[PDB]
């Protein structure tokens, strides 16, 4: 069979799909028309940004159907002859905003660095959290939690070893990673996650914790890391970039071998990202910690 | 079977809201959803479209909600069990040449109800090829001409308002969930 | 041994229903018999294998 | 349903400390317990540097009704509260019930089943309930007669839960 990809939609594409298809179909299902059931553009923007979080538009269709069903009830009940929905009266048709923030972290403390992931449900973002388990003053240790798979646990071990080796030469006096007990976690612990693409993210989190310096606030990075630090290509970067645009980042880090797959994206998607391509992790270090 | 006999349905929201308030306490969300469905049907001019599926824990008495809806809409009520069903012949009846043949439960509903537009509750649909025959009943593209093995003549079920209940939203039939 | 009946279960459902057994029709007689007055008692070893349409009757 | 979290020492306080977890807890709940232990260590270190209870003592953590298996990260903040209360010797508010996941940095994440938990708390005589801020939509979708008597608190980080559960 022929593999044909049907990628996800950005907020602009979702708005354009909704205005032209979702509202007209839902109005026809409810038996209404544009003359007495008007759904303004700003309402759809709020719905996309706060009442839905997905690559598709399946939840947005349900939200639009709910809004128009409530409008039909109001019209038939005689409460109002014509109904228009506005941001200040949207809560009369739908409950409180489900998602009140676009990202889990506004500003990232030193222990956490932002990353991107690709799953069967489309692109998404994850944050690799890292913090001490014992006070500082024997070998160190690394504990990993978050329903990580075997491949991702091995990637975390490789990342820890590479971060140790990197600090052994970039700053010999900083014995942090070789003598301190460290616990690493990935939020949403109920969701099983796997894949070696989180390697460089884990290295960046460990280095940021060891140096006590936060990463760039709007920087997301992906890419498998080797024991020597060479970055290896990863798949599913279309959905990763769509999610990164959804998450509101401005800088992204990609493996150099994936340059051929990033530019396949449309112009209006990649225009807002300060895209960086890396061959070895030292470039990621120079990007995440510019000074 | 009542050829062409119709009970005049009532789609007034005030009557339906009053009826749901007399015989049902609390559960304002379900009442709101039913009122919205009735308003949508009134605007559409007919009650056809998406089949209402009341799902929830066992022993909640979802049959009472369907009874109240039937009372409000002036539609005669009927009870249609499909839990554990494996034979299509329950839906469609046995062939007339069989010994002791009996038509499907739909024809029994038509005979007992004595109107062409009853409210039929397909309860416990999640414990239901038996699935394939039920698509033929709930699909308006073919609902207008229902053919059974007993009478062997088409019967028009266009105005029948099908309602169903289930114990879990993860119903074992996939194609039925879309409708 | 009502829990071991194979699905005959339709026959038991037809037989035990109080509204249906009032005109119980047999293949040989070809006339209905009013079994509404009889008294049924059932017996099983375990309730796990009894058919579901029987458990509410 | 209501569950309690019980903690006690295994040795006199008089090396790294340790946490023993029992109660037929699932893998996700054990991971949540480990995360809660690490976060409690960090929070007690930052709030009370002189208090070395968590880092030195050996603590056994139990959830009663051992015959029933338990799973889900919903007990995240609950375990942190139990550990901190044990470490400080301070009992929590005597009618407070709390739920919600906890991240390694202390952020509280939304959890499902808000209606059932709220009904159980109301039936169990609870007057104050702590929920994650992202569960506000789920809570306010409940009817008035279910939640009229609850002094509800919505939180985003455990630092607010600490002040809610430990006044003065």
DSSP string, A13-75: HHHHHIIIIIHHHHHHHHT--TTTEEE-HHHHHHIIIII--SSSSHHHHHHHHHHHHHHHHHH
Contacts A75 to B, Cβ<8 Å: 39, 43
The technique by which this structure was obtained is cryo-EM
Residue A279: count of CB within 10 angstroms of its CB: 13
Cβ neighbors of B157 (< 8 A, separation 6 or more) are B106, B116, B137, B143, B144, B146
Closest CA to D40 of D159, D163, D166, D133: D159
Cα A124 from Cα B83, distance rounded (Å): 41
CA A250, CA B37: separation in Å to the nearest integer? 45
The two structure tokens encoding residue C48 = 């796990």
Q: Which residues of B touch C53 (CB under 8 A)?
A: 81, 83-84
Cα A95 to Cα A228: distance, rounded to the nearest angstrom: 52
Q: What are the backbone dihedrals phi and psi of residue A30, each rounded to the nearest 5 degrees, phi first?
A: -75, -10
C-alpha A16/C-alpha B88 separation (Å) is 45
- Partner residue facing A31 (CB), from B13, B32, B40: B40
Q: What one-character DSSP code corresponds to residue A106?
A: S
Resolution (Å) of this entry: 3.2
Q: Which residues lie below 8 Å from residue B77, measured CB to CB, with a gap of 6+?
A: B66, B67, B70, B71, B118, B119, B121
Catalytic residue among A197, A208, A238, A245: A197
In chain A, breaks (C-N over 2.5 A) are found after 137
Rg of chain A in Å (alpha carbons): 23
**Residues in chain B after which the chain is broken, C→N over 2.5 Å:** 128
Q: Do chains B and A touch (3 or more CB pairs under 8 A)?
A: yes
Q: Which of residues 63-92 of A touch B (CB under 8 A)?
A: 69-70, 72-73, 75-77
| Residue A159 CB coordination number (10 Å) | 30
**Is D40 within 8 Å of D54 (Cβ atoms)?**
yes
Cross-chain residue pair C51–B84, CB shorter than 8 Å: yes
A181-185 and A122-132 as β-strands: parallel, antiparallel, unpaired? antiparallel
Catalytic choice (D115, D117, D136, D137): D117
Query: Distance between CA atoms of B66 and B145, rounded to whole angstroms?
Result: 25
Interchain contact A133–D (C-beta under 8 A) = yes
Question: Tokens in use for C43?
Answer: 């017996």
Q: At what angle do helices B13-23 and B28-44 cross, to 10 degrees?
A: 160
Contact D99, D74 (CB under 8 A): yes
Q: Return d(Cα A235, Cα A258) in angstroms, integer.
A: 8
Contacts of A116 (CB under 8 A, 6+ apart): A123, A124, A125, A126, A220, A221, A222, A240, A243, A244, A252
DSSP C53: H
Distance in angstroms (rounded) separating the CA atoms of residues B57 and A85:
35
* DSSP assignment letter at A156: H
Bridge partners of B146, per DSSP, are B155
Do B35 and B17 contact (CB within 8 A), yes or no? yes
Cα separation, B106 vs D137, whole angstroms: 43
Work out the end-to-end distance of chain C between its first and last CA atoms, rounded to an integer number of angstroms. Answer: 16
Q: Which residue has the tokens 């470039």?
A: A283
With contact defined as 3+ CB pairs under 8 Å, the chains touching B are: A, C, D
Q: Note whether B39 contacts A77, CB cutoff 8 Å.
A: yes
3-state secondary structure chain D: CCCCCEEEECCCCCCCCEEEEECCECHHHHHHHHHHHHHHHHHHHHHCCCCCHHHHCEEEEECCCCCCCECCHHHHHHHHHHHHHHHHCCCCCCCEEECCEECCCCEEECCCCHHHHHHHHHHCCCCEEEEEHHHHHHHHCCCHHHHCCCEEEEECEHHHHHHHHCCC
Given a contact cutoff of 8 angstroms between Cβ atoms, the answer to whether A29 and B49 are in contact is yes
C22 CB-near residues (< 8 Å, 6+ apart): C34, C35, C36
Is A77 in Cβ contact with B13 (below 8 Å)?
Answer: yes
B91/B132 Cα distance (integer angstroms): 11
**CA–CA distance, A272 with A100 (Å, rounded to integer):** 23
Q: How many CB pairs under 8 A join B and C?
A: 11
Looking at chain B from residue 23 to 42, which residues have their Cβ under 8 Å from any Cβ of chain D? 26, 28
Q: Cα(A152)–Cα(A156) distance, rounded to whole angstroms?
A: 6
Provide, as residue numbers in chain B, all residues whose Cβ is less than 8 Å from the Cβ of A73: 13, 32, 35-36, 39-40
* DSSP assignment letter at C7: -
In B, residues 47-86, which contact A (CB 8 Å cutoff)? 49
Among candidates B83, B99, B127 on the partner chain, residue whose Cβ is nearest the Cβ of C27: B99
β-partners of residue C32 are C25
d(CA B94, CA B150): 6
- The three-class DSSP label of residue C13 is helix
CA distance A68 to chain B (A): 9
Q: What are phi and psi of A42, to 5 degrees?
A: -65, -30
* Per-residue b or e along D104-121, where b marks 16 or more CB atoms closer than 10 Å to that residue's CB: bbbbbbbbeebeebbeeb
- Residue D127 CA to chain centroid, in angstroms? 17
**Residues in contact with B7: Cβ distance below 8 Å, sequence separation at least 6, in sequence order:** B74, B75, B76, B115, B117
Calculate the CA B40 to chain-centre distance: 18
> What is the C-alpha separation between D150 and D147, in angstroms, rounded?
6
Q: Is A95 on the interface with B (CB under 8 A)?
A: no
Q: Phi and psi (nearest 5°) for D68?
A: -100, 125
- C25, C27, C53: residue with CB nearest B84: C53
Tell me which chains share at least 3 CB pairs under 8 Å with chain A. B, D
- Round to whole Å and give the CA distance between A188 and A202: 16
CA A185/CA A196 separation, integer angstroms: 15
What Rg, from alpha-carbon coordinates, does chain C have? Answer: 12
Q: Which is it for the CA torsion A75, A81, A84, A89, positive or negative?
A: negative
D57 is catalytic: no
B/e letters for B88-98, b = 16+ CB within 10 Å, e = fewer, are bbbbbbbeeee
User: What are the C-alpha distances in Å from A193 to residues A119, A120, A220?
Assistant: 8, 11, 18
Residue-by-residue DSSP string for chain B: --TT--------HHHHHHHHHHH--S-HHHHHHHHHHHHHHHHHTSS-SSPEEEE-STTS-HHHHHHHHHHHTT--EEEEE-TT---THHHHB--TTSTT--B-HHHHHHHHH-SS--EEEEE-GGG--HHHHHHHHH-HHHHTSEE-TTT-SEE--TT-EEEEEES-SS-S-HHHHH-
């Amino acid at each position: 069979m022929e593999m044909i990809n049907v990628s996800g939609y950005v907020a602009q594409e979702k708005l354009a799909i909704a205005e032209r298809y979702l509202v007209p179909q839902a109005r026809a299902l409810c038996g209404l028309d544009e003359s007495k059931a008007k759904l303004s553009s700003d309402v759809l923007t709020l719905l996309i940004k706060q009442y839905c979080r997905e690559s598709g538009v399946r939840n947005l269709q349900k939200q639009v159907e709910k809004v128009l069903r409530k409008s039909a009830y109001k019209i038939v009940s005689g409460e109002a002859e014509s109904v228009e929905v506005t941001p200040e009266n949207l809560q009369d048709f739908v409950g409180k905003p489900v998602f009140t923030v676009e990202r889990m972290y506004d500003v990232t403390p030193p222990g956490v660095v932002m990353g991107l992931a690709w799953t069967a449900m489309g692109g998404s973002t994850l944050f690799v959290e890292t913090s001490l388990r014992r006070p500082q003053d024997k070998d160190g240790s690394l504990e990993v939690t978050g329903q990580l798979g075997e491949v991702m646990k091995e990637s975390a071990r490789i990342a820890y070893t590479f971060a140790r080796a990197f600090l052994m030469q970039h700053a010999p006096a900083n014995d942090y990673l070789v003598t301190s007990h460290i616990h690493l976690h990935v939020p949403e612990g109920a969701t099983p996650k796997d894949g070696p693409s989180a390697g460089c993210t884990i290295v960046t989190a460990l280095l940021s914790l060891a140096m006590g310096r936060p990463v760039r606030q709007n920087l997301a990075m992906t890419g498998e890391v080797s024991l020597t630090g060479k970055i290896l290509p990863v798949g599913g970067i279309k959905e990763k970039t769509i999610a990164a645009k959804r998450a509101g980042v401005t800088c992204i880090v990609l493996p150099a071998e994936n340059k051929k797959d990033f530019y396949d994206l449309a112009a209006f998607i990649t225009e807002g990202l300060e895209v960086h391509f890396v061959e070895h992790y030292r470039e990621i270090f120079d990007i995440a910690f510019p000074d | 079977i009542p050829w062409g006999k119709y009970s005049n349905e009532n789609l007034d929201l005030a009557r339906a809201q009053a009826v749901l308030e007399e015989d049902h306490y609390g559960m304002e969300d379900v009442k709101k959803r039913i009122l919205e469905f009735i308003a949508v049907s009134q605007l559409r001019g007919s009650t056809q479209g998406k089949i209402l599926c009341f799902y929830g824990p066992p022993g909640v008495g979802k049959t009472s909600i369907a009874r109240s809806i039937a009372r409000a809409l002036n539609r005669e009520y009927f009870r249609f069990s499909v839990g554990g069903m494996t034979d299509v012949a329950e839906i469609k009846g046995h062939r007339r040449t069989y010994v002791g043949a009996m038509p499907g439960k739909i024809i029994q509903c038509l005979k007992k109800t004595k109107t062409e537009n009853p409210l039929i509750l397909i309860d416990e649909v999640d414990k239901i090829d038996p699935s394939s025959a039920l698509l033929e009943l709930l699909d308006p593209e073919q609902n207008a001409n229902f053919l059974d093995h007993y009478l062997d003549v088409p019967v028009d079920l266009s105005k029948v308002l099908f309602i169903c209940t289930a114990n879990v939203t993860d119903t074992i039939p996939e194609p039925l969930r879309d409708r | 041994e009502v829990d071991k009946i194979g699905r005959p279960s339709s026959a038991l459902l037809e037989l035990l229903d109080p509204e249906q057994n009032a005109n119980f029709l047999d293949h040989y007689l070809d006339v209905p018999v009013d079994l509404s007055k009889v008294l049924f008692i059932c017996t099983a070893n375990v309730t796990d294998t009894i058919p579901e349409p029987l458990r509410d009757r």
